[PDB]
Design a protein around this nucleic acid. Structure first.
Ligand SMILES: O=c1ccn([C@H]2C[C@H](O)[C@@H](COP(=O)(O)NP(=O)(O)OP(=O)(O)O)O2)c(=O)[nH]1
Ligand SMILES: [Cl-]
Ligand SMILES: [Cl-]
Ligand SMILES: [Cl-]
Ligand SMILES: [Cl-]
Ligand SMILES: [Mg+2]
Ligand SMILES: [Mg+2]
Ligand code: NA
Ligand code: NA
Length: 326
DNA sequence: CCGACATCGCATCAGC
DNA sequence: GCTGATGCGT
DNA sequence: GTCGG
């Protein structure tokens, strides 16, 4: 919050490049800059000072000076006035509508919430559900509620099969006092990198959660990744809780640490840590950490018996989940 | 310069 | 039906 | 948009 104004500006620009410009690298660049400035323990006094930080170059340093001087940025002042950009930026806020679909809908004349509602038949299932819960998905989740949700998910999963292990990751695991959604990592002894001794492992869980009316909708569902909606139960006469987004990822039990590291995030942290691994000669995904050969081909998975092991391979001192929020 | 920039599951599509 | 690309969220 | 070689 020391440099709240600057990081907001950059995030706004980041979203602009992603949604409107469809320039993924400019989007990631801006986010990186916002991130590194967000952890900077001093109130930025000038662009130069910010340029010293990695991820901050000349262009941003300059924007930063313009912003500190005027309290705003002309480039965005205009972006804000452009009807098309405003429309696209908005449509992309619906879960399931991306830069492409967004620009597409605008051409077809669909540019407002009202339009989406009246043209529901022009949306795929995911988008349909995204619009349905457009308001609720805008709401944050208090940790208190996350704890309530955790209890349910963990207790219902135990009911299905005592050998299931569900860990809540994402921002929750990093200690956030509020989260955008609930992310669940799931493991079962039967499902390993070696073999899948039992089918429907993920299905059985989603089924049990829908059975107790916890899961309300499904954005997408596969063999190992479920993407949907849930809602805490309310008491008598009690106003209902907002509908919450929920992601469930089933990972081979023997690849838990690479899996939990990944799902704990943050996304930017994963980005910087994976980028760092490549520079060290390794490649990391949610299943393993493999070395990179002379050709660039990833080799066999290196043994991993803890999150710290992964950090060691890349010569990075361990960092608790609470300190990976970049 | 200029090439890289993290990684991949699920939905949807085009072509054969 | 299959595969490969693309979108999207990850 | 920024970075490294
Ligand atoms: O682009 C992505 C998105 C997510 N992730 C990982 C890290 C992230 O913490 C985790 C869960 O994704 P969410 O989008 O749910 N983010 P998170 O839980 O960190 O924060 P929020 O409270 O917004 O959900 O998945 C990536 O690696 N890359
Ligand atoms: Cl780009
Ligand atoms: Cl501004
Ligand atoms: Cl592992
Ligand atoms: Cl792998
Ligand atoms: Mg999350
Ligand atoms: Mg999530
Ligand atoms: Na810099
Ligand atoms: Na969207």
């Amino acid at each position: 919050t020391l440099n709240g104004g600057i990081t907001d500006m950059l995030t706004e620009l980041a979203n602009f490049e992603k949604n409107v410009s469809q320039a993924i690298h400019k989007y990631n660049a801006y986010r990186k800059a916002a991130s590194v400035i967000a952890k900077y323990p001093h109130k930025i006094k000038s662009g130069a000072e910010a340029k010293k930080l990695p991820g901050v170059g000349t262009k941003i340093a300059e924007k930063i000076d313009e912003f500190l001087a005027t309290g705003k940025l002309r480039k965005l002042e205009k972006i804000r006035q452009d009807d098309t950009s405003s429309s696209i930026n908005f449509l992309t806020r619906v879960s399931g509508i991306g830069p492409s679909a967004a620009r597409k809908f605008v051409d077809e004349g669909i540019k407002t919430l009202e339009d989406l509602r009246k043209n529901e038949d022009k949306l795929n299932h995911h988008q349909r559900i995204g619009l349905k819960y457009f308001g609720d998905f805008e709401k944050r989740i208090p940790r208190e509620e996350m704890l309530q949700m955790q209890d349910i998910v963990l207790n219902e999963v135990k009911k299905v099969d005592s050998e299931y292990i569900a860990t809540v990751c994402g921002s929750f695991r990093r200690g956030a006092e509020s989260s955008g959604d609930m992310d669940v990592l799931l493991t079962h002894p039967s499902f390993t990198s070696e073999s899948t001794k039992q089918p429907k492992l993920l299905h059985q869980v989603v089924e049990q959660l829908q059975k107790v009316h916890f899961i309300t909708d499904t954005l997408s569902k596969g063999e190992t990744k479920f993407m949907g909606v849930c809602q805490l139960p309310s008491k008598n006469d009690e106003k209902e809780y907002p509908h919450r987004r929920i992601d469930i990822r089933l990972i081979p039990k023997d690849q838990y640490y690479c899996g939990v590291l990944y799902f704990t995030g943050s996304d930017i942290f994963n980005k910087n840590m994976r980028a760092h691994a490549l520079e060290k000669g390794f490649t990391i995904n949610e299943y393993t950490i493999r070395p990179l050969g002379v050709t660039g081909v990833a080799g066999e998975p290196l043994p991993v018996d803890s999150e710290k092991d992964i950090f060691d391979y890349i010569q990075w001192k361990y960092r608790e989940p609470k300190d990976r929020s970049e």
